[PDB]
Amino acid sequence: EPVKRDSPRRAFLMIMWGIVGGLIGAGVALTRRCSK
Amino acid sequence: VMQLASWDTRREFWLQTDYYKQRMVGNSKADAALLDEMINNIQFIPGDFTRA
Amino acid sequence: LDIRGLFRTLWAGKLWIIGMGLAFALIALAYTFFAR
User: CB–CB of B16/B35 below 8 Å?
Assistant: First the structure.
């Protein structure tokens, strides 16, 4: 019997989605600097 | 060598040792996780006769 | 590279992009139903 599930490996999904969200949020914040 | 590298051999060896028995907590999932962790604690590196 | 201005440029003209993408998707649908 396996001890851990192969999918959806919550930790990896959290890390990847958080990194993507942080990157796109940083891009949005950068684009808003010249909007003022 | 086949017995040394066998996963089953390591599993039974860890099951029959007091080292694993004293670390059991009575929870089936935790005991299985500990057994799996200690099975990987034995690593067999095959030799190479070319490099002696 | 003024990405900050680029964000405003793409925001202003989003309607044309969406419309032409939908037209391209419709063309692809027609080609798909016209194939074997």
Answer: no
Query: DSSP assignment of B1-24, as one string?
Result: -HHHH-HHHHHHHHHTSHHHHHT-
Q: Does C4 touch chain A (CB under 8 A)?
A: yes
CA–CA distance, C20 with A13 (Å, rounded to integer)? 34
The reply to whether residue A31 touches residue C2, judged by beta carbons under 8 angstroms, is no
Could C4 and A31 be called an inter-chain contact, meaning their C-beta atoms sit closer than 8 Å?
yes
Distance CA B26, CA C31 (A): 64
Query: C4, A30: Cβ pair inside 8 Å?
Result: yes
- Tokens 């201005």 label which residue? C5
Give the resolution to one decimal, in Å: 2.5
Experiment used for this model: cryo-EM
A-to-C residue pairs, Cβ atoms closer than 8 angstroms: 16
3-state secondary structure C10-31: HHHCHHHHHHHHHHHHHHHHHH
State which H helix or E strand residue B30 sits in: helix B28-39
Q: What is the DSSP code (8-state) at residue A9?
A: -
